[PDB]
Amino acid sequence: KVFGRCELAAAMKRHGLDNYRGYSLGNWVCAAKFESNFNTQATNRNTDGSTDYGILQINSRWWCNDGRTPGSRNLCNIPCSALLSSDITASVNCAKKIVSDGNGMNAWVAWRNRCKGTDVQAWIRGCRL
Ligand SMILES: CC(=O)N[C@@H]1[C@@H](O)[C@H](O)[C@@H](CO)O[C@@H]1O
Ligand SMILES: [Cl-]
Ligand SMILES: [Cl-]
Ligand SMILES: [Cl-]
Ligand SMILES: [Cl-]
Ligand code: NA
């Protein structure tokens, strides 16, 4: 599923991400835009052989099991394919674990480089939430 900007904002708000660990909703929308272009089916393979999955590009090195990342962890206790569904619940629940692990949203490279320090509220402007 390729979400619209405001559609994803409302889905994330419903799933409890607005101000989660102090990160306003626009941070989460900006991160999803630049990680996946709002596409739940996005996958990208990393140089270490791990793969990033879904709207928030969650890495199989630590967070999910894809059966082909030897020696990796599955800290969200989910198959990575669950992160590709049209229902963003699994991605949101895993992201809440990631952002709580001490490094905040710096775990998302695209957030650090393209959202952090910008006017992230622009990402939810005009949306009916
Ligand atoms: C929280 C998380 O899994 N972030 C991943 C990061 O590990 C990976 O290096 C990057 C690759 O572009 O995508 C995401 O930022
Ligand atoms: Cl915001
Ligand atoms: Cl594995
Ligand atoms: Cl959803
Ligand atoms: Cl933080
Ligand atoms: Na893994």
Q: Could you give the 3-state DSSP secondary structure of residue 43?
A: strand
DSSP string, 65-85: B-S-STT---TT-SBGGGGGS
**Dihedral sign of CA atoms 68, 73, 78, 83 in order:** negative
Residues 6 or more apart whose CB falls under 8 angstroms from that of 3 comprise 11, 32, 38, 39, 40, 55
- Which candidate in 52, 66, 87, 119 is catalytic? 52
Please count the structural domains in the chain.
1
Q: What angle do CA 78, 18, 39 make, to 5 degrees?
A: 50
Residue 129 lies in a domain: no
Does residue 27 form part of some domain?
yes
CATH number of the structural domain spanning residue 120: 1.10.530.10
For a ligand 1 pocket test, name from 60, 61, 108, 116 the mutation site with the most ligand atoms within 8 angstroms of its C-beta.
108
Give, in degrees to the nearest 5, the angle at Cα 29 between 24 and 33. Answer: 150
Three-class DSSP category at 39: strand
The residue to mutate among 109, 113, 116, having the most atoms of ligand 1 within 8 angstroms of its beta carbon, is 109
DSSP H helices, 2-120, are 5-14, 25-36, 89-99, 109-114
Domain, as residue range, for 98:
5-124
Spatial CA neighbour of 50 closest among 32, 36, 66, 35: 66
Report if residue 43 sits inside a domain: yes
In degrees, rounded to 5, the angle at the alpha carbon of residue 39 between the alpha carbons of residues 23 and 75 is 60
Element (H, E) at 59: strand 58-59
Residues 6+ apart with CB under 8 A from 95: 17, 28, 56, 58
Beta pairing, strands 58-59 & 43-45: unpaired
| Euclidean distance between the first and the last CA atom of the chain, given in angstroms as a whole number | 20
Instruction: Identify residue 42 by its one-letter amino acid code.
Output: A
Question: What SS3 class is residue 128?
Answer: coil
User: Rounded CA gap, 120 and 33, in Å?
Assistant: 12
Q: From the CB of residue 86, how many other CB atoms can be counted at a distance below 10 Å?
A: 10
Is 101 known to sit in a ligand binding site?
yes
- Report in angstroms the alpha-carbon separations of 94 from 26, 117, 128: 18, 24, 26
Q: Sheet holding 58-59: strands in order across?
A: 43-45, 51-53, 58-59
Active site residue 35: yes
Ligand 5 centre to CA of 103 (Å) is 6
